[PDB]
Design a protein around this ligand. Structure first.
Ligand SMILES: O=C(O)CCCCCOc1ccccc1CN(C(=O)c1ccc(-c2ccoc2)cc1)C1CC1
Ligand SMILES: CCCCCCCO[C@@H]1O[C@H](CO)[C@@H](O)[C@H](O)[C@H]1O
Ligand SMILES: CCCCCCCO[C@@H]1O[C@H](CO)[C@@H](O)[C@H](O)[C@H]1O
Length: 268
């Protein structure tokens, strides 16, 4: 048990070193306790335009694919963030010694099949029932606005809110999440994995570490560990549905570009 604390703290440090925003930072912004200035609320076309003229985005607008329409534009911003988060997750995983010890092709397999599950878990951190943070916490896009986008773009967004609000009710902190996300990435079930026994062994250790961490950090929280195992299963279903919806976008939205890295993740 005492051995897992060291293991856990290293994973937490990898998390702190590699992710742009913590849940702690996100919730302070969402509750209006973080700074002297509040996020700019994006809730319609006019405010989206004002945000693109005003807020500082990690990805410059000029850099996005040529403009098509509002729903597609919002989709392109979603892809921006997805790809950036894949980069952060890759570095997080590499800051974990037992992941970096795997052959590079298994690293790629784990990331390919794990990153969307991790993304949608981490998404909950910047979400509340009314919308989500964008542009490093400088903006807040309302759930209502995102609902108003045309199908298929509104359809691919709303189920993530449904998941997030339920996930946030578990009240995990950043140290819980670091272990949770590591367990999603270090998953021995992924297709085409070469060294399955090594990955299963690492996953098992992470989950033992997660169990012990939760007993210490959430001493009154009954059933939290099994609840999180179930959330892992729920994320797999969420990502299956997500991938199906992405296949439909590829089929029916032929004018919409998909980022080369995401094409490789979704290469069927
Ligand atoms: O599958 C892929 O990899 C790309 C396809 C993802 C499509 C589904 O993206 C969703 C769905 C639900 C909730 C959040 C996102 C995307 N997202 C975001 O952080 C995000 C959301 C909205 C905006 C935005 C900017 C201006 O107006 C709106 C910017 C960023 C986080 C998952 C990474
Ligand atoms: C940056 C980490 C995340 C990478 C995710 C993208 C993985 O794409 C896959 O790359 C493999 C190695 O090139 C190919 O053999 C596969 O066909 C392809 O699907
Ligand atoms: C083709 C559709 C493109 C939609 C917009 C996606 C842009 O994503 C950005 O592309 C860069 C180049 O890889 C990454 O380095 C950044 O991290 C990422 O934020």
């Amino acid at each position: 048990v005492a051995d897992l604390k060291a293991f856990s703290k290293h994973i937490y440090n990898a998390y702190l070193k590699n992710f742009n925003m913590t849940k702690k930072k996100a919730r302070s912004i969402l509750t209006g306790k973080a700074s002297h200035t509040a996020p700019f609320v994006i809730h319609d076309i006019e405010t989206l335009w004002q945000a693109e003229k005003g807020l500082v985005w990690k990805q410059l607008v000029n850099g996005l694919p040529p403009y098509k329409e509002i729903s597609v534009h919002v989709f392109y911003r979603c892809q921006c963030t997805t790809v950036e988060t894949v980069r952060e997750l890759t570095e997080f995983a590499k800051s974990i010694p037992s992941f970096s010890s795997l052959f590079l092709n298994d690293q790629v397999t784990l990331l390919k099949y794990g990153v969307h599950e991790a993304i949608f878990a981490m998404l909950a951190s910047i979400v509340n029932k009314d919308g989500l943070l964008v542009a490093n916490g400088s903006g807040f896009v309302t759930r209502e606005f995102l609902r108003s986008l045309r199908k298929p773009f509104s359809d691919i967004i709303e189920p993530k809110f449904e998941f997030a609000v339920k996930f946030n009710a578990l009240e995990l902190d950043d140290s819980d999440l670091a272990l949770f996300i590591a367990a999603i990435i270090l998953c021995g079930d992924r297709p085409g994995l070469m060294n399955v026994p090594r990955v299963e062994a690492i996953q098992d250790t992470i989950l033992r570490a997660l169990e012990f961490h939760l007993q210490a950090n959430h001493p009154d929280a009954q059933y939290l560990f099994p609840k999180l195992l179930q959330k892992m299963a729920d994320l797999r279903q969420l990502v299956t549905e997500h991938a199906q919806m992405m296949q439909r976008i590829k089929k029916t939205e032929t004018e919409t570009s998909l980022h080369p890295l995401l094409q490789e993740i979704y290469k069927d």
